[PDB]
Amino acid sequence: MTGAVCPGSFDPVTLGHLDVFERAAAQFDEVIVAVLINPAGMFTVDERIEMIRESTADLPNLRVESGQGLLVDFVRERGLNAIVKGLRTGTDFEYELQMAQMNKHIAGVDTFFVATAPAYSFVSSSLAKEVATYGGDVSALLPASVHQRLLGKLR
Amino acid sequence: MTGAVCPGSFDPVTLGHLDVFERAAAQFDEVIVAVLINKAGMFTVDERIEMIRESTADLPNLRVESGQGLLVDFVRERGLNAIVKGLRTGTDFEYELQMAQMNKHIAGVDTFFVATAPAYSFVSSSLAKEVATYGGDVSALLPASVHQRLLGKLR
Amino acid sequence: MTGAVCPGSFDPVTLGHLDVFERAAAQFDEVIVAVLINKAGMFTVDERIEMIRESTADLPNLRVESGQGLLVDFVRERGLNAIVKGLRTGTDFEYELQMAQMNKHIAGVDTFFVATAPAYSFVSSSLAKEVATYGGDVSALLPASVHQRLLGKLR
Amino acid sequence: MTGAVCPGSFDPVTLGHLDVFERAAAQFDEVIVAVLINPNKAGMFTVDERIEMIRESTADLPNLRVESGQGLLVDFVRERGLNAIVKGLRTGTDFEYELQMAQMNKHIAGVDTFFVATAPAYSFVSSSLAKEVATYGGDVSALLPASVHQRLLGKLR
Amino acid sequence: MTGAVCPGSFDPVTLGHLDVFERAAAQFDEVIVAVLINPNKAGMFTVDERIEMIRESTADLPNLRVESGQGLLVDFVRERGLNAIVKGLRTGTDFEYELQMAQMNKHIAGVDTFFVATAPAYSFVSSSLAKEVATYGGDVSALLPASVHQRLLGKLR
Amino acid sequence: MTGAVCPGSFDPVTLGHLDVFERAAAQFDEVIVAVLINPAGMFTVDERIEMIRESTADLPNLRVESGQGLLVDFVRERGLNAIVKGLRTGTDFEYELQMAQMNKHIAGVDTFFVATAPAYSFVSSSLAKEVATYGGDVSALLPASVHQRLLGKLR
């Protein structure tokens, strides 16, 4: 039984995230999306989880959970030791590499990186929110349910 | 009827910026420098605009305006669809690429990048202010007008 | 009286190149595609030129010429002093920056960089030829005319 | 029935490669090491030598096997009923080229590429730099598995 | 009478920093570790604590001394009759910003900056990531000198 | 007694190289420029050494020697264990980092990197030769004696 964790704040989840989720779910027996919260954003943890579940309805081996603290503890507590992280334009890859090597050192957890599809490579949660805030149309970059909710939080 | 917008916070404008303005003005019929308002910074919007106008008096086809909201709206509301953005040492080019792809997606606006001259490649508004704050000589890196104004804000 | 030169070996021209040509032609009055002759490659200079002309028939202000020697001489001998160069995934941008600074130094020619559309961001002439050689379908990544011609050279 | 292909020329395999093999084998049900051969440029080691050196240093990995191939990697992957590649990263990896290839490979064949950074201890070895250093007498013994080191010295002498 | 300044906030010093200190001390007649303080943002450790942790882990380096400062690094360097900075590189270093600062520092004061990559074993530690990991219970004991680790745990508790 | 080696092929030496030499000579008691030859260029080893000696006449603690084989052997044979390498626009820094870590591992030799001055940041031996070959003026980027010799080898 294989498995990996897909971590992020997902505030909100984007089609870039979904693409990575789909690829993880296709290649591992079990995937857990870890909605990591800070001491703070647009959507509550519960809202974020609901948006991810709506978007991943077709992935029966993927589940969504909230987490706090050390990512490697979240991973190991669930009997796993792999992380799958997406890459997009603007990803701080050098910092991701630093964290991957740190996470392997402190807990033996591996990190696999996968680039999101070119079509979704320039969306990020932060930039989608910024563009939407000023009336820009990011509907092609987000799940339909997310775009609906986003307009709600803004209007 | 060609034209481009050169965006930035310009707090203050540097010779690195001016070099890019000059190239934009040499290659496009019309250039608009967009002083993006959203942090208070050191100089007020009017001061920034004044300093740019003073530094670009020899560029007849260049004008300076402030703007709020999406950069692409600023560009499109003036009948243009090109941005000219400078590169220097320390530019977050990956983030600029993300924004360029987003801006093309949401509004059909092209972004052209040009590297500033080597002599001005290590100045930024932030680093110039920091160095000058602590008594370093940045007079070779700023328009003569700007430099005096900066000393004024500090003393 | 604005103008830019779009240089490359174009062996063959891709949709990534065409996207850049289209943007250059939309933002400058005059565009010259420079097919730089110096390795024999797959297609002859005349074939490359033909394929570009066929692919750019809807761009009235664009023309195609071959060139030898310094790119800056090609540009300056046509009364221009701007280069428009595309960026894709795998572009050696650091080398392009070195050449841009050198070209500005020796001839006062500016270089503007523009990222090609995400959909065409992973095609290159080399990778398209390699993949097609081994039977991969690159028809979505090349002008329809070019694609048939490529199949011809292979079969 | 999960699985991935770990590709390379492995001329010779290094401890950097082996680290990546081990991680892939720990995270996928089956792993195939694809020894990709250019039929028009011989390397230092023959295909059989390359395969033997990998097998001898992966004997502890029961779910890993080693096969050679040529042409499109995605055909090698798909003909084995898989659609994942696991590729290692080290210092000096042309990551932008690997990203270009990954996006191309997804486009033409639907195959996903997962990248994993090799351990810091092995992050500066590559087949090419190991061969170069050894050619001029440098000690690369700590960077290559035992199945490789003296065979490499043999080729050079 | 050669010499270099090794700058940082060292809040706390890591084994990555110490590796760089050791290399600088091996290659220059004198080394000064400059503990640069922002007078308007306190860190986890006080200046005296930072200096004590560095001193305790550099006792074997007779030609290294430790001093705090603020403001322009190049003034700290020049007022000591030196004109070289030795700065470490690790994974996640903002090298482009360091390059910008190096060119600025040469321009305004004639001071040269030499960069050296820390050892692979210490390449993924940083003061900030060590503090973050330790805050949430992760084991960073192998990445920090003995002068630091339990003091860090003390601050966090 | 401190010391470092500055390695390269220097075919020919540029002002970028000279800037690095000067900084090494200012910071180390002894500097050795290692002219490394391959199994191949424009100038012979002896010509390269002569051009470097002409350019470094004012550096009494710097000497020039040819070398073959492992750079770390060259360094250690001379009682040293430091390398000083310059950085310019277009340097393959990731490969330099790989070699530095390899060189430290196999022989305990440290590598210090220093960026050349912005004015000399876009010259390289290869690009200077290429530009000069087609009649471009690189005289501001090379020592006077070198530029003289370069015109000689070309004409």
Ligand SMILES: Cc1ccc(C(=O)O)c(C(=O)O)n1
């Ligand atoms: C698909 C994807 C991958 C990575 C990131 C990230 O860098 O945090 C993002 C995002 O910024 O929201 N998105």
Ligand SMILES: Cc1ccc(C(=O)O)c(C(=O)O)n1
């Ligand atoms: C000439 C120039 C080009 C780009 C930038 C930028 O990254 O915003 C700057 C700056 O930081 O002030 N300056």
Ligand SMILES: Cc1ccc(C(=O)O)c(C(=O)O)n1
């Ligand atoms: C669209 C595009 C932009 C740039 C390049 C290049 O790096 O030369 C290429 C290509 O490799 O064919 N293509």
Ligand SMILES: Cc1ccc(C(=O)O)c(C(=O)O)n1
């Ligand atoms: C461990 C490892 C990962 C990737 C590579 C590569 O860039 O091909 C190598 C190598 O070059 O031999 N090695």
Ligand SMILES: Cc1ccc(C(=O)O)c(C(=O)O)n1
């Ligand atoms: C060894 C080392 C070198 C450089 C840095 C840095 O980027 O400031 C660090 C750190 O962040 O603590 N550490």
Ligand SMILES: Cc1ccc(C(=O)O)c(C(=O)O)n1
């Ligand atoms: C000053 C300098 C530093 C490094 C290099 C290099 O990368 O080889 C060069 C060059 O290319 O000739 N020049």
